[PDB]
Symmetry: D2
Subunit: 310 residues, 4 copies
């Protein structure tokens, strides 16, 4: 679709970022990925971000990315498919073009690699990536790539296909300035690692959607929180925070990278064997997986038959 069409889709509901499934040999496992994506499809997120951060973008070989996007497209139905993109300009442009070729509906541009950069340089980098494709682009303020409002305004003026802004900084002061400056020129996407913890505050900042990483494994719970958020049903949001999210955060905070690793464990627990994380992430221990299983609780989508003899 064209950039205005993906822009519309971004404003039409909750955003899905599926984990990328690997086999025991570490290879992309398309059959498993498709099974999981097809299940998620019944929950009707309007945009699916393949090979995003929750999808371990940062551990994929660039040649894997179009393959993953194409697999998601097979089963995503009437859903917009956005691909992760990133690294320095030369690599990012090659990835962007390769996923445009395989029919992505947009790109989410993760930070360039390693260095701190001046605003003028961020401008030049992001402009070059946006101009390399005709599909829609969402920028992603996080880590070593944080656009100021004036720089983002210049990008918006010179790149019509730049239609979205995702925040991973948690800097309310800055993101409210950005929405004040750009208004409806961009769709504003919450991007903190467990975004429900920020969503009520982010409404005031001007953001009415976000990536729900936990939608990977408790989509019914994530959809309910989202509906409650949009309806102003504070007591419902709060109950779900207290009973699910803060306990999840306690598991997630046990080690670096668990914002991804714990989500992938949840997916496995729900009966999709998404496989291990790639180093340098590490998987949850069997004990920690058990903690997450207990938390999922009434939201389990199956029962397991654990091995036993006599």
């Amino acid at each position: 679709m064209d950039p205005e069409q993906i822009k519309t889709a971004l404003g039409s509901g909750l955003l899905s970022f599926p984990v990328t499934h690997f086999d025991a040999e570490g290879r992309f496992a398309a059959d498993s990925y498709r099974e999981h994506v097809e299940w998620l499809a019944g929950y009707k997120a309007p945009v699916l971000f393949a090979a995003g951060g929750t999808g371990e973008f940062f551990s994929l070989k660039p040649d894997e990315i179009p393959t993953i996007v194409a697999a998601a497209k097979e089963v995503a139905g009437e859903t917009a498919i956005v691909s992760g993109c990133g690294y320095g300009t030369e690599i990012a442009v090659d990835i962007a073009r390769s996923v445009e070729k395989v029919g992505a509906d947009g790109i989410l541009l993760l930070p360039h690699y390693l260095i701190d950069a001046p605003q003028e340089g961020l401008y030049a980098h992001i402009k070059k990536v946006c101009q390399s494709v005709g599909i829609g682009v969402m920028v992603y303020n996080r880590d070593n790539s944080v656009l100021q409002a004036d720089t983002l305004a210049r990008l918006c003026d010179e790149c019509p296909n730049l239609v979205g802004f995702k925040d991973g900084t948690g800097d309310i002061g800055l993101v409210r300035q950005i929405t004040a400056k750009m208004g409806d020129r961009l769709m504003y996407l919450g991007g903190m690692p467990t975004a429900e913890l920020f969503a009520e505050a982010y409404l005031g900042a001007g953001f009415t959607t976000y990536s729900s990483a936990v939608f990977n494994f408790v989509p019914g719970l994530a959809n309910e929180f989202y509906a409650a958020l949009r309806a102003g049903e504070r007591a419902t949001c709060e109950r779900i925070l207290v009973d699910f999210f803060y306990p999840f955060m306690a598991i997630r905070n046990r080690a670096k990278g668990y914002a991804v690793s714990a989500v992938k464990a949840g997916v496995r627990l729900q009966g999709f064997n998404a496989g291990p994380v790639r180093a340098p992430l590490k998987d949850l221990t069997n004990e920690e997986i058990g903690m997450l299983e207990a938390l999922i609780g009434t939201h389990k989508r199956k029962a397991w038959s654990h091995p036993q003899f006599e």
Copy 2:
């Protein structure tokens, strides 16, 4: 008043934190302060925080604090008066007791001095301060004193006079967890330096008021923003952010400590003789004062205005 009465007052509108006025010899200028407070009183903030951060608490001798509190109380009218308090436990308790004696309605407890401390030590320190007085206490999460939700819950269960929570961290994740845990047990006060920049977001976090430092010198504009915030008039809030607050931020960001220095400059520009900041703050350059004067623009205090 009793802690429940200050608690109620904290929930009744916008919070005022007056700058502390100093004279030529560097001393607290009580006439000028009282004059400024009396003018501010016309703009009807329900709570006045004397000798808070904006009031340069961190540069006051402890014996100056009761003098300043007493001065505000003289001319503040039917307005709750909360005093700054801070430092390590031994100093904080002395300060707290001294301001209770001159009729403070509460204390805002700024961080202890210098060190990083374990949660259980924060708990011990804050508990001792709360237990040293009968008036209401508001804790203040910022810098080297950041309470987690569980620690704060323990304090609330053991110190009935602990009735307010100010945030200066900007950590949305944490403050939402805090309001979810405590609910109406505490009043939640926004406390980022230029808090209007955060107010709309903080509503969703569970906070419906904040310290407006700029109320010191453009109380009308600060009231206009607050009214629009509480009414859900986003376009009005946004106009004021774009036309006044982001330009103010550009000035504030030119040097460390300007969150206080630029406010004091604004007060002097509006004709209240607030004097210099105390070191280690510095005052704005004449160029910067000029920038603030232009920004104040149509909100300039005029000789022909009616009180």
Copy 3:
């Protein structure tokens, strides 16, 4: 003594920062403090910093500080006594004058309270404190008070009694620039938490002494490390780092504030009634105390 005399003493050996002793009722325990200081004097540190950071300066009432300085002065002999000082300018000046009155040979100026400040403001604050007394002053780069080299040079030109510079930032780039700019105008004092971990690197930066917090309870070992440092005996320094300091660091890193709490625990283990730390610090658990005792081993008194 005059600032040039405290300056010379700062360059004559290892620096001692005794913990401040408190009794059951929570007051300063002068008898206990004096007993501990008198024992430490046997180990011959040329300068003793009373009510510094390790001495819980940040938890003391301003009127306690002269009492502590006076107690140290009673028993320290031919040792220079520097007092902690800090907070904002009005409080700092009052402390500085009060300790000069009871005979402090110098002050160590800890950061002002709470706020981040511009260089021009740090200049104004520090200058006012220096000009309030005749005794020597050491500034202390740490936390919210970090002087750049040009600002410190201005202070040195203006304030003859400013004679020392203590670093607690660990910013090797900055401290080398400072020593290159000022040269022998100042004495350079290492001030990281557990400064032996930094001492060999700090030699190259231009610093040949530091505060040894562990001198509080293993003064002999601290002296052994220092002598090896100055003699260039790397294998000896390294043995002591591996066998004592990194294991100590492992205990210290178990909780915030243990850079002070663990040292105080060590002092109590050597039979001095130093008492508890003041909140918001917390004391070591019994388990942790046991670990420290085992580590101290044959250095037990």
Copy 4:
């Protein structure tokens, strides 16, 4: 060469990290690169790191890296050539094998991309990269990849070809612990931005060499500072800090990324056609290039 031979070379002098030359269109300019590398070779650094950080590794396509390494090898003479490597494991292994194939003598492993990672994950990633090649590996503690001493010891026990450790953290406390733990098992390389500012302190930490980015454009000055350093000639080191390095640092601190951009400007000022930086770095302004030219001063290579 074998890992022990590259290890010996790392301990034999100063380390050179040439900027990667680009044409106006941003493409690798091999002829200009080789001219500059040949000029630097007269100053006898024992190891040349091609496509390191100063060489804009982070802006190169993986397929460019072997071409740059091969270019350096043409003209570097009897000099060990180490290639940059980095990113996540899948990319890093392919880069490592590609530069081994063009005859690199080692790899310097820059951080993986983007994420914070647990120590056990860093271990697994770095082990897989080390085991993918037979040439020497230097790890690089920087940003989102900071090995603790115990993790590094595990890697050293498992990976005999891991022979060097470069520090970009400035964490003196940690690096001294690492040298105390590993001793002569590793060669210790200073890796801060403008490393001469740290070199005297780093001696005490156990480091006797470092990357000299400014060697790109004032190699005589860099060699003299290094010689004074190893001779214990403090007044000479200090004079060069005061007269050259602190003024350079003032230019460097004007904008993000200038640790690379200012060095590349210096190379251009000395008459080599190094070209622009790639975004998201930016080049110095005309005003700043004038400042640097004035600073180079008596050390100009030509008029």
